[PDB]
Ligand binder design. Structure first.
Ligand code: K
Ligand code: MG
Ligand code: MG
Ligand code: MG
Ligand code: MG
Ligand code: MG
Ligand code: MG
Ligand code: MG
Ligand code: MG
Ligand code: MG
Ligand code: MG
Ligand code: MG
Ligand code: MG
Ligand code: MG
Ligand code: MG
Ligand code: MG
Ligand code: MG
Ligand code: MG
Ligand code: MG
Ligand code: MG
Ligand code: MG
Ligand code: MG
Ligand code: MG
Ligand code: MG
Ligand code: MG
Ligand code: MG
Ligand code: MG
Ligand code: MG
Ligand code: MG
Ligand code: MG
Ligand code: MG
Ligand code: MG
Ligand code: MG
Ligand code: MG
Ligand code: MG
Ligand code: MG
Ligand code: MG
Ligand code: MG
Ligand code: MG
Ligand code: MG
Lengths: 172, 185, 58, 159, 183
RNA sequence: GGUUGCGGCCAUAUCUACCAGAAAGCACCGUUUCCCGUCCGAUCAACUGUAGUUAAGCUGGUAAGAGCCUGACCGAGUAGUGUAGUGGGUGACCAUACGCGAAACUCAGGUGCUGCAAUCU
RNA sequence: GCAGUCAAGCGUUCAUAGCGACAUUGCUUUUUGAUUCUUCGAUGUCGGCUCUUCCUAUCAUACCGAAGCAGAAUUCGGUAA
RNA sequence: GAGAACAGAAAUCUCCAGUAGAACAAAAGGGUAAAAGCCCCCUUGAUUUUGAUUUUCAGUGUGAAUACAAACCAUGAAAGU
RNA sequence: AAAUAUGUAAGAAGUCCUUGUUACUUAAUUGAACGUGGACAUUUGAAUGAAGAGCUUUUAGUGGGCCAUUUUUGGUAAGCAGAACUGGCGAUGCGGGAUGAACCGAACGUAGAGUUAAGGUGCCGGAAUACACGCUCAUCAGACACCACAAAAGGUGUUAGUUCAUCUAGACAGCCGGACGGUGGCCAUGGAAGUCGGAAUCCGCUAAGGAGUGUGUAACAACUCACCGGCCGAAUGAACUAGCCCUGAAAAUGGAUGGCGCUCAAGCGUGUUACCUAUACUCUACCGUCAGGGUUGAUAUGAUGCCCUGACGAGUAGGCAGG
RNA sequence: GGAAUACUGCCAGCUGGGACUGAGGACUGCGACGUAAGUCAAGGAUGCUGGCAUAAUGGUUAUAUGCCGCCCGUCUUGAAACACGGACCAAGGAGUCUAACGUCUAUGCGAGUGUUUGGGUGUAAAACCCAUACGCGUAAUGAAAGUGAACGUAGGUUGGGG
RNA sequence: GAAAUUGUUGAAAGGGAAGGGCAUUUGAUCAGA
């Protein structure tokens, strides 16, 4: 729904006299802020366990920063989404420097290719593929060849002015 | 836009001056406006309000009513204040000596009070004697005794005096007024 | 020509303009439907209580 | 044509609470009703005399009269834009004592006791009920309770 | 609070901060086409005009009111800075109801001094810490008449929930930024 | 603790199939002059408490018993549903947000409790 | 009224050259209904004659594809008014 | 369901099971099992007086109904009805 | 057996203690009702609000309604006909939806400034030919809810996925070689040899071959394929799923994403900012209305006056007031 | 292991530019600074300066330009309507008066009230004056015959302004 | 000796109506200190 941050959200299923110290369930939620993070936490906990916001509590919320924000990684992403006619599971691969950037790319890509809005997508799993040759999508694999170089043909520079006096060039 | 919780520009619904154009009544209202503003006297405030009242809201107070009010325990020496007309009553035979301040006195009422040995004063004389309404006793006539009142709220099983011009047999007494003709009320 | 038959449309708005009024509770409510035997004896009990309370001022 | 009888549309309302048909138990008749008692009306379909109209099913009122087998109940019926006083003559099988005020009476007694013990022990009253307050801070331990990480489950049909 | 959080983390526990006792609620919806129950709740919270705001002491009885009026209000947890700026700039008191600006501490003392509130900072304190006389101090405060936000609402459409990219509902800590831009 | 008389709640008390029951009580059981009622002293009435019996009633126990009752993060926060959007979808319908929240199912447990009076190994 | 989709069958064999049951999706407003929104201080109410234009769901003419097209004739279909 | 001459599917006699699967004037719904059903006994409360109340409702009328009061009765051992 | 909706209660007309009346009631000063006297005001017993609350009289107009979401009945359906709750229109302008009674936003005294709503920012036209990731090329592209339509069924168009398979012990495609024997397998048939049919789906040689995938004959024959090999050398096949696009897709004057026009968009999905502007919001001024107040202590003539303070201002039918 | 920085939030931190506004009209207040005097940005604009001294500003009017603006009245759920009336203008043109009444208000008198049928009188339809009646009210109720309003401090209880 | 309607003169505007609102240019005209 915006530029994403990843939050660990831990909730409780609030204690009673019968059950003190309940079982402290945790989730990694990609959300643009903490209100949405906690909302998504309760949404998925209600999908998983007999609990709701009114019968539980948020024990903790903590943003998780990328441990290595400046190393390029290949992420495998497993999602579950609703199409116009059904629900489907999908696996994709995204090359980027952080989980939040990978997830933002994934949401953009789901919207672009499957018209799957945010509300229709569940992030099942995001995991860095530590070993290349376990990358199984060609659109990522092509970026892992040795000494990868490519030109950027047909450069289009934007003019600051309405009129130009030169009949410009697209060389690069 | 504002979601008004009440009627906007609603008038208070109370008189702030007499409808009367009596210049003397307006002078009394001026005096008691001054007093009510600058005395902190509940008596002065209620007398100022009473000076605005219409005629049917100022029912006459009879000397009988005054005598009963004075027979009240401890009231025998209080000055009786009637914002309205004091009327005479021949049904009483022993009127007490008292001071009565009233807007108007009937000839017979003034005569009875003075013959009993009291005084009939005006409301400005009352204001001079008791600017805070000391030792006063405000009397009010029987408002809900007007002939018009007995027709108010007419309806089935109300018992409220139909509006009628001629009374007697043949005049609104047969069907709807007895069980032998259809039903009763 | 047929017309509309019935609707409660606007009725609650009309009723709430002057508001639904609670019926002005009173102490000493009327004894209208009360058992006439109880009422007959209550009159005598009250007359006796009044006489006693009057005589009790000596 | 249309049909609005006295017991129209009462088919389920006046039924006998399945496997609770038959004779009315004796506590219903052993109950004692005084003028001023607050009663809930629930018609017993097996007692066709002294039966309330369907409007008064689930209504709560005040006993104003007591007769041989019945009580007079005062209900405030909403008609038009105001309330009208209705006086029903209901047999005791159609009314029960209301517990809408037992909590109030118990609070009254506890409040008197607390006020007495307070003006005997010190100075504090706190006699007004309070709404459920926001929770206070707490420390939640992980000893034996290390957080388990859940993830959304993939779709499947299991049909 | 900071030290308790650090100590719980150092002890391997989680410090669950206390639930918020005070909310600020701003009516973000106009006065047309409001269903009767939300409209009555708005009138009882004194939000009778768009961009009017009030402080609400959080209980069950008031949380169930906020629940009803959620699509018409943005609310959240006000900070001390937000409350202080609200009372300083847009603080008005009810004296013969007379919407009197809180320009001097004498007015606050004359109307709330019987509760121990002698100054505008006494009032702010009784608001931020929900004191024994919060009801009287908050009712003495005239509903705050805020402007539209100065940098916009931050969203293209206001009338979906804050969680769904809109403006209404609980925006818990971002109410401070919204109210600061509205003040 | 058993039993009777009167009971309260009216199955955790009911139903089916077996087994056990000391004391007392209850019961079956014996009789037909009287009161009474019957086609029939079977029921009902009366008399005896004597001739007999725990066979039955009754009480309790047993049963991976039927039913019933209780509870549950069991199913299920599912179905449904209040509120919201210039959400999706041609539509049928659906997703999401803020709330409320079943029934079936599954499992575990249980199988009358008790008031007044009298009486009893 | 016109047109699709599926394809059990017809077509000596062969589902689809040409057809096509049981179903099912549509389109059109040259049928007739349904409605009563406009017109009852009045829009002249059948048909024909005359004349112009428009549509294409094409009868013919042009050029074509298909056939259970040898020729001839015909049939199905495309661009086409 | 199990039995008894004529007598069988239907006659009358007997036992067992039987929560109502019958009956209660009529339409339907509700209600009812030592009864509200069936049979028997006695009866006229289907009476008198004039109020209150509920539904329809304007809180008018009419119809119907509810609970009392004041009498006279019926029934039952009685409470009661 | 919900959700929503709904009755009642949350106190001084209360609670507790004692004891007077009665012709009612009890076996009974038993009880019932009403009292006398005595005790209990910081929270007098939840929350929030309260331009106050209560009460009365008297009259106008109206008594054709319609629309939207949701619930819902009849009907194939309807801009149809009928109900429920709410909100609207009527009775209402204003910004937006080009246009439009009802939709969105917001309701209106006269002005100024600022900020916004909904909606927009290529040009018309105020406002980024903004930024970012993708998708789409339509010889009928598409382009913002109400709303001014399109479906089933299809497409090696293109994109992204799911699952199952083959593959250096050599896969797919391609070219070439083999594709037999028992055997004219059994039955029938007028004839039927793998191939008009029913049934049986065997065995050997086998690297491999179906009692046969098709063409063919009257039956033959003869070609051909499953199946296995030769060549090549790294990937490949099948069935599904759903995005955009295309086919499906035919009407009458010439015409409508509003127009122009737009194709790494000015289209579609999504994300982030900046910006534009309503009679809305904020502040101020002025007009009026209402409310609360001050001021008869004098020269002082407008106390129905003068003055202070706060709030408000839509309007048909209609009422009233001041002119 | 030690930092930095981002992000978010706070400051009764400092400070530059731009726009609109200047209501009020002796003093009174709350403050600030100052040792105190006094001063101040503290209950609303002052100071300095220039040009003009009239069509210059402004008003009015015609026109032009930008954007907007359907024909009123009427019935109607809905009118600019392809609904009706209206070619134009002047003058006329439609809730009146009366008998009897309801509510409310003003006035006079008040258990009474109403002089004006009539009489007297007059400066002559005026004004002024007046007897007896009569009307309404002071008593209701019943079909009627008829009867007819204090147990009491004209009652008790609860609330009740003063 | 009004208006409708009309002549003349003067002024002004005028691509399939005219009229109107806000604002200002221009021309004409004018009060106030
Ligand atoms: K016509
Ligand atoms: Mg009608
Ligand atoms: Mg029920
Ligand atoms: Mg800005
Ligand atoms: Mg917006
Ligand atoms: Mg025997
Ligand atoms: Mg016997
Ligand atoms: Mg035995
Ligand atoms: Mg069992
Ligand atoms: Mg909406
Ligand atoms: Mg119609
Ligand atoms: Mg004509
Ligand atoms: Mg014509
Ligand atoms: Mg064609
Ligand atoms: Mg019986
Ligand atoms: Mg009837
Ligand atoms: Mg009409
Ligand atoms: Mg109308
Ligand atoms: Mg509107
Ligand atoms: Mg449009
Ligand atoms: Mg522009
Ligand atoms: Mg499709
Ligand atoms: Mg052959
Ligand atoms: Mg298309
Ligand atoms: Mg555009
Ligand atoms: Mg986009
Ligand atoms: Mg403005
Ligand atoms: Mg005033
Ligand atoms: Mg107005
Ligand atoms: Mg910063
Ligand atoms: Mg000028
Ligand atoms: Mg226009
Ligand atoms: Mg019409
Ligand atoms: Mg019109
Ligand atoms: Mg038309
Ligand atoms: Mg006409
Ligand atoms: Mg005409
Ligand atoms: Mg005229
Ligand atoms: Mg002349
Ligand atoms: Mg002329």
């Amino acid at each position: 729904m915006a530029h994403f941050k990843e939050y660990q959200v831990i909730g409780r299923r609030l204690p009673t006299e019968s059950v003190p110290e309940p079982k402290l369930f945790r989730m990694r939620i990609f959300a643009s802020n903490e209100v949405i993070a906690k909302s998504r936490y309760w949404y998925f906990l209600q999908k998983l366990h007999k609990v709701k916001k009114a019968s539980g509590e948020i024990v903790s919320i903590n943003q998780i920063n990328e441990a290595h924000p400046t190393k390029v990684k290949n992420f495998g992403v497993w999602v579950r989404y609703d199409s116009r006619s059904g629900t489907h599971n999908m696996y994709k691969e995204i090359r980027d420097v952080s989980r939040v950037a990978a997830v933002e790319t994934l949401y953009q890509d789901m919207a672009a290719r499957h018209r799957a809005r945010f509300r229709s997508i569940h992030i099942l799993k995001v995991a860095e593929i530590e070993k290349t040759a376990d990358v199984k999508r060609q659109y990522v694999k092509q970026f892992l060849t040795k000494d990868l170089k490519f030109p950027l043909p047909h450069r289009v520079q934007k003019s600051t002015k309405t009129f130009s006096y030169k009949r410009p060039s697209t060389f690069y | 836009g504002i979601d008004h919780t009440s009627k906007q520009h609603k008038r208070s619904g109370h008189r702030t001056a007499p409808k009367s154009d009596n210049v003397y009544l307006k002078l009394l209202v001026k005096l008691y406006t001054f007093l009510a503003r600058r005395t902190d006297a509940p008596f002065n405030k209620v007398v100022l309000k009473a000076l605005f009242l219409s005629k049917i809201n100022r029912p006459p107070v009879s000397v009988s009513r005054i005598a009963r009010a004075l027979k009240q325990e401890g009231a025998a020496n209080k000055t009786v204040v009637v914002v309205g007309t004091v009327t005479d009553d021949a049904r009483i035979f022993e009127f007490p000596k008292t001071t009565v301040a009233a807007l108007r006195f009937t000839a017979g009422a003034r005569a009875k009070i003075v013959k009993a040995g009291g005084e009939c004063i005006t409301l400005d004389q009352l204001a001079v004697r008791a600017p805070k309404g000391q030792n006063t006793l405000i009397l009010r006539g029987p408002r809900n005794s007007r002939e018009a009142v007995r027709h108010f709220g007419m309806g089935p099983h109300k018992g409220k005096a139909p509006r009628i011009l001629s009374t007697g047999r043949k005049f609104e007494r047969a069907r709807g007024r007895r069980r032998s003709k259809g039903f009763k009320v | 020509a047929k017309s509309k038959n019935h609707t409660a449309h606007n009725q609650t708005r009309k009723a709430h303009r002057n508001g639904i009024k609670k019926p002005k509770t009173y102490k000493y409510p009327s004894l209208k439907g009360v058992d006439p035997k109880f009422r007959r004896n209550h009159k005598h009990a009250l007359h006796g209580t009044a006489k006693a309370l009057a005589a009790a001022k000596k | 044509g249309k049909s609005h009888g006295y017991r129209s549309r009462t088919r389920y309302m006046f039924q006998r609470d399945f496997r609770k048909h038959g004779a009315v138990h004796l506590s219903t008749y052993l109950k004692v009703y005084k003028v001023g008692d607050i009663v809930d009306i629930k018609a017993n379909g097996s007692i066709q005399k002294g039966m309330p109209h369907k409007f008064y099913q689930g209504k709560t009122g005040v006993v104003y009269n007591v007769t041989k087998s019945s009580v007079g109940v005062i209900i405030n019926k909403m008609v038009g834009n105001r309330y009208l006083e209705k006086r029903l003559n209901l047999r005791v099988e159609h009314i029960k004592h209301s517990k809408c005020r037992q909590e109030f009476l118990e609070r009254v007694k506890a409040n008197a006791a607390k006020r007495a013990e307070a003006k005997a022990q010190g100075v504090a009253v706190q006699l007004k009920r309070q709404p459920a307050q926001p929770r206070e801070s707490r420390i939640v331990s992980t000893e034996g309770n290390v957080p388990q990480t859940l993830a959304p489950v993939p779709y499947e049909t299991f049909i | 609070i900071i030290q308790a959080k650090r100590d719980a983390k150092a002890a391997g526990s989680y410090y669950v901060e206390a639930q918020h006792k005070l909310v600020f609620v701003v009516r973000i919806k106009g006065i047309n086409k409001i269903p009767p129950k939300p409209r009555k709740v708005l009138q009882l919270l004194r939000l009778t005009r768009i961009n009017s705001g009030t402080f609400v002491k959080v209980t069950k009885a008031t949380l169930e009111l906020l629940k009803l009026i959620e699509p018409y209000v943005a609310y959240g947890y006000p900070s001390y800075s937000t409350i202080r700026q609200l009372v300083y700039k847009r603080g008005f008191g009810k004296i013969n109801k007379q919407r009197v600006p809180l320009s001097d501490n004498a007015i606050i003392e004359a109307n709330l001094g019987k509760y121990g509130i002698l100054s505008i900072d006494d009032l702010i304190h009784e608001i931020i810490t929900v004191g024994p006389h919060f009801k009287q101090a908050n009712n003495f405060l005239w509903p705050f008449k805020l402007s539209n936000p100065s940098g916009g609402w931050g969203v293209p459409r206001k009338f979906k929930h804050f969680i769904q990219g809109g403006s209404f509902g609980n925006r818990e800590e971002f109410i401070n930024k919204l109210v600061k831009s509205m003040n």
